[PDB]
């Protein structure tokens, strides 16, 4: 296979495995069935952006009911209509109400994945009579360079240390093994990026395996405009952690599906507005500042920071921040314009449960 790759001068084998993995539509099917989405009643191949937008609109109606204190018939009506637009498989049981921030957030995550799956299914379409290998066709449509890095390189070592040293103490249900590492160069990001802003940090972002084709092809995006604001602890920005496992939790890997990806991005934080508890309306509080920082109780300290190509890497271990209702365990950072983000590394990670 290695020799066969050299003679044909095909795409690098590691990149081939990465593309095959993220473009696997059968895995998207299984992932959505796991989230209770009824793929039999509404196949993913027929999913449209208008259907998904309608879904968000019904979630907003649910949010309105919750806000006005309608927890009986009107809420069960509004939940049923969401469920008509975004069919679920609850088998024989009463379709459950959506009543809490958590439950609303779960539905938003379902619709976010469906949005990325709609993107993926279009992107993966091939020209049957084309001489190009299907993987090359997929890769080109990403408009995003992915280059494997040498495991004996300094970059690989620092990123491995970042991964391990910021694995949080409260996320002890797994450890992570870095299987491979790719440099990311998304078309347009280098030119768009807010290089002028200070406090540029290399930060984590995790997502479900179904979402990477969307993320790489469109960049990290803020939430859909029709999505319920209450779905977002600090409003409709792009969320990042300085603790690898806080983000890795959003991979939703498991003992059954133990391979996930983690993204590192340069984030132009500028001046952070620091907040101690949830506020979905945080974006309106910036008043000229460039980012929101949710303050955690535990965080990497500046003593241990290194610089990698002009961005700060907040190496662990985490320690008490002196910061303290309920309070975040770990920091989170939100920027509200994609031009404050430049994706830089994609980690292929094995989760050990
Ligand atoms: N998706 C992520 O990696 C992440 C990072 C910080 C906060 C949240 N909610 C998510």
Swiss-Prot record:
Phosphoprotein keyword on record: yes
UniProt-annotated location(s): Nucleus; Chromosome
Record-stated family: Belongs to the ARTD/PARP family.
Catalytic machinery residues: 332 (for poly [adp-ribose] polymerase activity)
Entry protein name: Poly [ADP-ribose] polymerase 2
Catalytically driven reaction(s): NAD(+) + (ADP-D-ribosyl)n-acceptor = nicotinamide + (ADP-D-ribosyl)n+1-acceptor + H(+); L-seryl-[protein] + NAD(+) = O-(ADP-D-ribosyl)-L-seryl-[protein] + nicotinamide + H(+); L-aspartyl-[protein] + NAD(+) = 4-O-(ADP-D-ribosyl)-L-aspartyl-[protein] + nicotinamide; L-glutamyl-[protein] + NAD(+) = 5-O-(ADP-D-ribosyl)-L-glutamyl-[protein] + nicotinamide
Full-protein residues shown: 235 to 579 of 583
Binding residue positions for NAD(+): 205-207, 214, 221, 247
Annotated ranges, domain PARP alpha-helical: 12-125
EC number in record: 2.4.2.30, 2.4.2.-
Record note on modification: Auto poly-ADP-ribosylated on serine residues, leading to dissociation of the PARP2-HPF1 complex from chromatin. Poly-ADP-ribosylated by PARP1.
Keywords: Acetylation, ADP-ribosylation, Allosteric enzyme, Chromosome, DNA damage, DNA repair, DNA-binding, Glycosyltransferase, NAD, Nucleotidyltransferase, Nucleus, Phosphoprotein, Transferase
């Amino acid at each position: 296979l290695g020799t066969e790759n050299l003679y044909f001068q095909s795409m690098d084998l590691r990149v081939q495995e990465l593309i095959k993995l993220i473009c696997n539509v059968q895995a998207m099917e299984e992932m959505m069935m796991e989230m209770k989405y009824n793929t039999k009643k509404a196949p993913l191949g027929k999913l449209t952006v208008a259907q998904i937008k309608a879904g968000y609109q019904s979630l907003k109606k649910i949010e309105d009911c919750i806000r006005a204190g309608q927890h009986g018939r009107a809420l069960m009506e509004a939940c049923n209509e969401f469920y008509t637009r975004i069919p679920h498989d609850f088998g024989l049981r009463t379709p459950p109400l959506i009543r809490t921030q958590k439950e609303l957030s779960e539905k938003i995550q379902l619709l976010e994945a469906l949005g990325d799956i709609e993107i993926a299914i279009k992107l993966v379409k091939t020209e049957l009579q084309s001489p190009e290998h299907p993987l090359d066709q997929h890769y080109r449509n990403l408009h995003c360079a992915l280059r494997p890095l040498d495991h004996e390189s300094y970059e690989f070592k620092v990123i491995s240390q970042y991964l391990q040293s910021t694995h949080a103490p409260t996320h002890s249900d797994y450890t992570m093994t870095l299987l491979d590492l790719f440099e990311v160069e998304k078309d347009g990001e280098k030119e768009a990026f807010r290089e002028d802003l200070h406090n540029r940090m290399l930060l984590w972002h995790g997502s479900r395996m179904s979402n990477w084709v969307g993320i790489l092809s469109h960049g990290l995006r803020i939430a859909h405009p029709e999505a319920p604001i209450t779905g977002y602890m600090f409003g409709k920005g792009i969320y990042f952690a300085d603790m690898s496992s806080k983000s890795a939790n959003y991979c939703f890997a498991s003992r059954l599906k133990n391979t996930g990806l983690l993204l590192l991005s340069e984030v132009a934080l500028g001046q952070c507005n620091e907040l101690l508890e949830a506020n979905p309306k945080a974006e309106g509080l910036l008043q000229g500042k460039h980012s929101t920082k949710g303050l955690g109780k535990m965080a990497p300290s500046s003593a241990h920071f290194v610089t990698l190509n002009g961005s700060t890497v907040p190496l662990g271990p985490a320690s008490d921040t002196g910061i303290l209702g309920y309070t975040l365990n770990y920091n989170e950072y939100i920027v509200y314009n994609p031009n404050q983000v430049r994706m830089r590394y994609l980690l292929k990670v094995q989760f050990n449960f």
